[PDB]
Amino acid sequence: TTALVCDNGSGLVKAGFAGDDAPRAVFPSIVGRPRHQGVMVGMGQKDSYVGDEAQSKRGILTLKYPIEHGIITNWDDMEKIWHHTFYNELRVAPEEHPTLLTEAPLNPKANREKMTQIMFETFNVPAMYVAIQAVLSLYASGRTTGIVLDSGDGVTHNVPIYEGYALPHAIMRLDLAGRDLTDYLMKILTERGYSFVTTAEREIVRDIKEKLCYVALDFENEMATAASSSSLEKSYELPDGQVITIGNERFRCPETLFQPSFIGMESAGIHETTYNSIMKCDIDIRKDLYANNVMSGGTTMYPGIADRMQKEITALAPSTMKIKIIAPPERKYSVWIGGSILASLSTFQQMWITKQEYDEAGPSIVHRKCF
Amino acid sequence: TTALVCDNGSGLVKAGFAGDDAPRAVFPSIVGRPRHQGVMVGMGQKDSYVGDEAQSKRGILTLKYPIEHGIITNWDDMEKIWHHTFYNELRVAPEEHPTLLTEAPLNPKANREKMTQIMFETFNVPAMYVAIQAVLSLYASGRTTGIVLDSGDGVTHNVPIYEGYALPHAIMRLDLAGRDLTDYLMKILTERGYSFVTTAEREIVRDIKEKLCYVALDFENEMATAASSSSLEKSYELPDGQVITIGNERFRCPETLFQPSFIGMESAGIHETTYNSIMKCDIDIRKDLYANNVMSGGTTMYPGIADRMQKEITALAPSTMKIKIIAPPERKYSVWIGGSILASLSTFQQMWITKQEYDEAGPSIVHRKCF
Amino acid sequence: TTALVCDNGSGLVKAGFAGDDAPRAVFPSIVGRPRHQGVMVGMGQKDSYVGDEAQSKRGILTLKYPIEHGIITNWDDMEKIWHHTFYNELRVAPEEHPTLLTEAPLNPKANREKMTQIMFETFNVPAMYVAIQAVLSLYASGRTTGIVLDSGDGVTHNVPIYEGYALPHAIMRLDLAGRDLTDYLMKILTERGYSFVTTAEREIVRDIKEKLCYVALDFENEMATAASSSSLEKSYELPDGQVITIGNERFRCPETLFQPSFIGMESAGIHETTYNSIMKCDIDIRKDLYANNVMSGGTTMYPGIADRMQKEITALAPSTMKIKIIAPPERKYSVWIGGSILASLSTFQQMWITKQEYDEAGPSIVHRKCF
Amino acid sequence: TTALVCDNGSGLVKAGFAGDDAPRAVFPSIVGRPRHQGVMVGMGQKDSYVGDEAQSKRGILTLKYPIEHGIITNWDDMEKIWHHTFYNELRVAPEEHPTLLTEAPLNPKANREKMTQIMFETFNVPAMYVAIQAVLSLYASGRTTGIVLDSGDGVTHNVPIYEGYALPHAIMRLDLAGRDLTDYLMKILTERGYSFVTTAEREIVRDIKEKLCYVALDFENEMATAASSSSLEKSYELPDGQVITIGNERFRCPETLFQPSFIGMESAGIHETTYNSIMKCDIDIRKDLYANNVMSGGTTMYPGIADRMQKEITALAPSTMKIKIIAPPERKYSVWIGGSILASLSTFQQMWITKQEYDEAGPSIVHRKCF
Amino acid sequence: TTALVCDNGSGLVKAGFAGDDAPRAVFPSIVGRPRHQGVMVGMGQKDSYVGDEAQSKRGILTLKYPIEHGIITNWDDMEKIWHHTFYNELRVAPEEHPTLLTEAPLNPKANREKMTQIMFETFNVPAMYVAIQAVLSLYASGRTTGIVLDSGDGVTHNVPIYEGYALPHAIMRLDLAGRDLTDYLMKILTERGYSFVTTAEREIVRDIKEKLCYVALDFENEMATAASSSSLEKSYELPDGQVITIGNERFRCPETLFQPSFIGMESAGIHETTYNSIMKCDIDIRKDLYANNVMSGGTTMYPGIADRMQKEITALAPSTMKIKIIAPPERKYSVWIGGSILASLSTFQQMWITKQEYDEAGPSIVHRKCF
Numbered sequence A, B, C, D, E: 001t002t003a004l005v006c007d008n009g010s011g012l013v014k015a016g017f018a019g020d021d022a023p024r025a026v027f028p029s030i031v032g033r034p035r036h037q038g039v040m041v042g043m044g045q046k047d048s049y050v051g052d053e054a055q056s057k058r059g060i061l062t063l064k065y066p067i068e069h070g071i072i073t074n075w076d077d078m079e080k081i082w083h084h085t086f087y088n089e090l091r092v093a094p095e096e097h098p099t100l101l102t103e104a105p106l107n108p109k110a111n112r113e114k115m116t117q118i119m120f121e122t123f124n125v126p127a128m129y130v131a132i133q134a135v136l137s138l139y140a141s142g143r144t145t146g147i148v149l150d151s152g153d154g155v156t157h158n159v160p161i162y163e164g165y166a167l168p169h170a171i172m173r174l175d176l177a178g179r180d181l182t183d184y185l186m187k188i189l190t191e192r193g194y195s196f197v198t199t200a201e202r203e204i205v206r207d208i209k210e211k212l213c214y215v216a217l218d219f220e221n222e223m224a225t226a227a228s229s230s231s232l233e234k235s236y237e238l239p240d241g242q243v244i245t246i247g248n249e250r251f252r253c254p255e256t257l258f259q260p261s262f263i264g265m266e267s268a269g270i271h272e273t274t275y276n277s278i279m280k281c282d283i284d285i286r287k288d289l290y291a292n293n294v295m296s297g298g299t300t301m302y303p304g305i306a307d308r309m310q311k312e313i314t315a316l317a318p319s320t321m322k323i324k325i326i327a328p329p330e331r332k333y334s335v336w337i338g339g340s341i342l343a344s345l346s347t348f349q350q351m352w353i354t355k356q357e358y359d360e361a362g363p364s365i366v367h368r369k370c371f
């Protein structure tokens, strides 16, 4: 019975049932359309490949995301993905379960609103709830206090929570995220002749990133050692068997998370952003935040990113403050896990917005909150 | 068995049992409410943190006092504190013990009245009595004659007693007290960039005051020496590890007790106030008052305040009169101790106002007196 | 001949000559540095655009203020601005005129001190004087009695003056100011998809604010009417021709001046702050303060802010007290005008601190006062 | 009932009925006219021998093709051949069946156009369709993905198809084909005195080619071994009983398919052409193309041509890519078979262009496509 | 004296002296080798025809470019061309002049690097500098602000510059260029029987393109009018006197610059690419970019391409933004002219990289920049 938990992210979709210890359906939020000789109808063929299908057929498809920086732009393709989950991956009659959805804070109200509408009308959902991803991530850690740094492909955001009592006043959001890192790699790999321009090629670059990139603890001295050939130089085999050799880029791309100016992102680096949000809060809180820096999301899966982070924050902070980062394994699922927790939680059941309530109240109901 | 003694002050609450040599429960009279995103209900959470709880969670709470200058303004929060004592700190069934309460002289009758009502009705107290704090302080000293200068956060007051036979005609009261000293520090620390504005921040300033402030024996020459860096300059570490450096303020704040004009308090300084109350009394008494100046209360815990006081009074008085100040250690508990004494005293048992008596007589009974 | 008057505010700089009926040089206190490909030297180019220059080139510059909440933090950029005025906007040999400077009360002494030093040493100023902005504002109104509420970008402050004889004891200062209003708009506009994050974008938001925001006389009922589309919904054209539509935000942002809790500013609203400062003063004064509430500063240029203010204070005050607000046109220049007045005033000439005096006395001289 | 399938190639004509497992009529696309003493009329005699007739009477006829490199040049002779099929070889009333025709890609539009016209007007065809030969060949193999290399007498061409979704963007065409191989033999046999110059003689050379030529796996070392007499030296008996002995030419002629420069064909060899078309496609596709190289057409009937091909492509490709060639028996009929398949296919019936449609629309209709 | 300016493009080479108002040597970057009977040695003959020589002898040569999409692939042939310029076309002792070279942005570092090496070692160049072509083009226009769209045979690229201060963050590059247009013509002319396959034939097609192709302002309606014979149908005489008639192709080929999907180029059209780069930049800049769209390069020499461009961008942009294209005559030389300007510029002389510096520093020096 129970409910569904759906991490409808900007990168990919993680869906499963509340109470599960992991998602059952994990696939990319991509819809692919035929590039050459536009479509054939009565043969079936197909012109809308989704997720792993799009991956399989990738070479001849135009890969589009529906989501841009946390915003659902292409609601039609979004709908297709929802359908694909419910009927192809989980294969369960939507209307039999409540649906827990998640989102990044500070989204345009229209996203929460219209998305809700669709769930109720198109999919006949019985009840649903929308939660902030960072909050859920904290639940997964089991801490009641800390800063949650959650970062994916569309956005990066920071939420500070103190023994419950989340502090809305200091929530921050950056457009700097995984897709920018990927784009930077396209630009940087160009230095060595490795031109990538199509959406299929973008995907390949992503694969590279996720396997070879790492965070240097000292980018300047990393670059210094990079003057000599070493373990930095690492091969990668393409889909067609050709081999790529990557050097400085292994960490120069991750560097942009601390040196955002590289891509024209005139803003603070992550470590600065974090530090600043601490400064924005009451001095009596700061201490506990320093010792409870929760990190989650796929873009925190770079080797040594936590260590680099700790180092940098320690430098910014007063020497007497203990800087400690909470960054368990399975950070990719942190949000989903948090969702499973709350959905299984007894108290939480009062939160469900039923379709009945929606119909009686209307759209605005999605912004309510109480526990 | 016996009774309870409760120093329900303006700063904090000191409670224990009659006959104890010290309070068992000592905590600040503060109720804290959530600043950000107003409260959550069914999770419990809590929206009313009291005393040390308020301290622990201070950063996200609005700290309010129920008492202003000795007057109970917020009876609801007052009630909460009473509850907290009885059930969380002492953890004793109120109705099993008589309760000795204390107050500053010249309060509005409604305080004594309504407070009494609550004790009898809400807490089902069996018997109670309200005493003047200064009087109790004298009992703690064990003297039968002297002037009691008792000063806390809300008020400062002077009572002169001569071999018993307290002299109501010359009781004096000032609004100048600990909270004004704290406020002055906020204003003075601003000179060095140390801005404090929230109630949490107020609390921090208090902590500073109580550790670093002292009374100069000669403020003018203290300021003279302050021209050069010295031991006057003293560091202080904040909750978040940042360090504050304080100089002149170490004593400039305490100076306001002798130079009240600094804060617009158009009145006499403490030493003058004392001297004047002596002048207000019969010349045959004056002598003994000069040699028995009892000092108590938390705002007399500044280093050298007694010595400064003695000096100043000596200057005002005739040279042949021996000026002697009685200022033992544990001045913070003087009143409470006095309460313990009388509550244990055999004779005193006749003073108890029983709920029965109250019910038979009514409110006005709280103003009776005889020994 | 005569002297110069310089309103070196937190927002912008208004400079002119004493005796002028208006500033000759009005431009923002901003220094802009090249974002992309850090600078070119021998071509000149320029890497320090100031004021209107920074505005013109805004898109590719990092806009920084030197002043934060009334405090000069970046003295180098501050110096650049001073230079720009004297040599580019007024184009007058600094050393030929005395300089009247202004500041918010309760600043760290180091500001007045170091600023003075620079004027004398770097710019070879002959004589100078520093005055409190609120005081000057009163002079512009021509009243001898009233409360001056002056509010800009960095700070908001309240000074009460009674027939001269300014009352230092009740001067109040808030960090809540124009920059917070702007930041709140960034956060609130996000609700509609209008993301602004760069310093260039901040500037755009400011422009919006200053043209479309207004104060509702009843925010609750304003929000009620806001349920329906109306004149509340107002278009705005961006620099690139795109059009923005703004609704509730038109007044929800101004609301924070009365409901500071919206941004976590745990303090009183303006109307409360004012009322409280009146309560802090002697009851014989209060009457005249009620009938003489002087309002000035750029953040008082919201439509209906005076009317809203009057309403709220009237509610707080006793019904028999006549609440009257003094809020002429040209409130933006009130301080500067006051400066012109005093600088032209005969009596006032004795106030000038000459460089000679400074050299003979030293820094501390800047805190003298007598008329 | 059903329809007809006609492989009207550049070499010969293969006709049969849809659903047949083989053509019923297979004969060369040749029209022969009397060389000596131009024709006799009223005796009948005949001056237009077609196909096998032309073969039988070959010695005294001028053999002409109507098709040159896939283009129909002599429409009159073309018409004669169509007639011969329908009335002499299949012997079926044209108008009773739909006709599936085939062609090489990138033909001049006029071929498809005018040919269509003739079918409808001269032969009163009810419905027809024109398909690309390579595509049909793939259908015969039954694969959904692969590269089809189809090569006959007039042209050689390459089409890459990926799970349907044929990729028009990388279709390639070469003039290098069977007729060039034949011409090269005429030139090479001349080295040994074997002069062939007439069209009858050309035909003989073709016969030789098709029986004795083979592809060496290593032409250089084949030539090395050719220094000694061996099995390379092979006899051939002419129509008049004379015997020809052929040596190096057995494989030197086939070599031109990999070494086209031999005949001045300044272009890539077949293996290079294939490889390049793979390079022209998306890297995500390349893999499957490598493992699915479909080969068809009469000029792929040389012994060992597949093995030689595989070898060469393997050399060009990355070592990790599995190079596999699909080259079943009956490659000569692959296209025809594919035609039979689609014509029998249910879905495909919608493709038929009826004469009615043609009359209502006009010529341009022949370029439509949808499934 | 002075220096040399060399537009070593992907199409052709334009060389002259700094300060000249035009190139002195203009010829194609082609090396031709004998197709038939590979070479004769001691007779001289020649096997390496360059530029106009290759043109003259074209029929019997294999024409190869050294450059592919901006990348130097055949360094040997590249060297030959350099030689040909210096000793046959300009006929000047290389080592006597500094050499200004140009390139497309985002090239592999190895190009700049190795090319530099050769200049210094093989040709003993005294000093040299490498500049971005688009930047130079802007200098030729004389504007300080604008977008430079520069497009040749190998690449198309976009650089946006704002009052100097070039914006590296938004530089874009497309593989879509002149050679693709030529290839498309080969494919499209095939529709009418006009088969072109050799490198000599490629060259002929180029000649056609450059004389007859034009950009339609409305391709759909152009195609509509193309249904009737008109001025669209235009004759062309080949080298051997045969005449070609071209119709739709006159503009269908140019259409691919706006409809890149025609050749499988899954990317934005030029007008979209431009528009998008504007969107990528700060909103305060956008305005000036809209009104200053600089266009240069040989592939912008199609009739009406500017007008078509303007139309399309205007459609994409907001109606209030003035869209203006800067497209003077002599766009083919824009880059070269810019080079002449800077080389003659006094300030610029500091930019020269001397061989001495190179020897002392090494390869990496070529990536320095400052003015």
Ligand SMILES: C/C1=C\CC[C@H](C)OC(=O)C[C@H](c2ccc(O)cc2)NC(=O)[C@@H](Cc2c[nH]c3ccccc23)N(C)C(=O)[C@H](CCCCN)NC(=O)[C@@H](C)C1
Residues within 6 Å of the ligand: A069, A071, A106, A107, A108, A110, A111, A175, C190, C192, C193, C194, C195, C196, C197, C201, C242, C243, C244, E283
């Ligand atoms: C352009 C502009 C206003 C135009 C908005 C357009 C007219 O209306 C839209 O719809 C915009 C559309 C929209 C979508 C859906 C909807 O239901 C409602 C709005 N969100 C966006 O465009 C946002 C996109 C965005 C990125 N992170 C965000 C975070 C929150 C909100 C939006 C964004 N967005 C225009 C910008 O970010 C860009 C980039 C600025 C930050 C640098 N990366 N810059 C601006 O916005 C400023 C300049 C003003």
Ligand SMILES: Nc1ncnc2c1ncn2[C@@H]1O[C@H](COP(=O)(O)OP(=O)(O)O)[C@@H](O)[C@H]1O
Residues within 6 Å of the ligand: A008, A009, A010, A011, A012, A013, A151, A152, A153, A154, A178, A179, A206, A209, A210, A211, A297, A298, A299, A300, A301, A302, A332
């Ligand atoms: N091993 C990895 N190393 C670094 N980054 C990764 C790794 N795996 C994933 N990522 C980044 O995280 C992105 C998605 O993670 P996620 O946070 O789940 O996105 P979203 O939450 O929007 O679905 C990936 O697409 C990639 O950009």
Ligand SMILES: Nc1ncnc2c1ncn2[C@@H]1O[C@H](COP(=O)(O)OP(=O)(O)O)[C@@H](O)[C@H]1O
Residues within 6 Å of the ligand: B008, B009, B010, B011, B012, B013, B151, B152, B153, B154, B178, B179, B206, B209, B210, B211, B297, B298, B299, B300, B301, B302, B332
């Ligand atoms: N070490 C100290 N030095 C100076 N002042 C102190 C010290 N400790 C406490 N105080 C002052 O005394 C105040 C409270 O003392 P107390 O007289 O008990 O208040 P109350 O009697 O109203 O409860 C403190 O809050 C502070 O203002």
Ligand SMILES: Nc1ncnc2c1ncn2[C@@H]1O[C@H](COP(=O)(O)OP(=O)(O)O)[C@@H](O)[C@H]1O
Residues within 6 Å of the ligand: C008, C009, C010, C011, C012, C013, C151, C152, C153, C154, C178, C179, C206, C209, C210, C211, C297, C298, C299, C300, C301, C302, C332
């Ligand atoms: N028309 C307006 N409406 C509302 N607020 C305004 C208006 N014009 C200016 N402001 C606010 O006043 C600010 C600056 O005014 P000012 O008081 O002069 O600042 P400062 O005194 O620090 O220079 C502006 O930057 C803006 O925040």
Ligand SMILES: Nc1ncnc2c1ncn2[C@@H]1O[C@H](COP(=O)(O)OP(=O)(O)O)[C@@H](O)[C@H]1O
Residues within 6 Å of the ligand: D008, D009, D010, D011, D012, D013, D151, D152, D153, D154, D178, D179, D206, D209, D210, D211, D297, D298, D299, D300, D301, D302, D332
């Ligand atoms: N046994 C063979 N070996 C080699 N080549 C052959 C053989 N048989 C036929 N061919 C070549 O194939 C040519 C025709 O095959 P085909 O592809 O059917 O031509 P088309 O498809 O144009 O009708 C023959 O005429 C000959 O050139």
Ligand SMILES: Nc1ncnc2c1ncn2[C@@H]1O[C@H](COP(=O)(O)OP(=O)(O)O)[C@@H](O)[C@H]1O
Residues within 6 Å of the ligand: E008, E009, E010, E011, E012, E013, E151, E152, E153, E154, E178, E179, E206, E209, E210, E211, E297, E298, E299, E300, E301, E302, E332
């Ligand atoms: N009249 C013309 N019309 C259209 N395109 C032309 C014309 N002349 C040249 N081109 C195109 O421009 C190409 C080369 O111009 P150019 O930009 O100088 O190349 P590159 O800069 O790489 O040397 C030509 O080879 C051709 O593709």
Ligand SMILES: [Mg+2]
Residues within 6 Å of the ligand: A007, A009, A133, A151, A152, A297, A298, A335
């Ligand atoms: Mg996520």
Ligand SMILES: [Mg+2]
Residues within 6 Å of the ligand: B007, B009, B133, B151, B152, B297, B298, B335
């Ligand atoms: Mg006390």
Ligand SMILES: [Mg+2]
Residues within 6 Å of the ligand: C007, C009, C133, C151, C152, C297, C298, C335
């Ligand atoms: Mg001001």
Ligand SMILES: [Mg+2]
Residues within 6 Å of the ligand: D007, D009, D133, D151, D152, D297, D298, D335
């Ligand atoms: Mg065939």
Ligand SMILES: [Mg+2]
Residues within 6 Å of the ligand: E007, E009, E133, E151, E152, E297, E298, E335
């Ligand atoms: Mg060029």
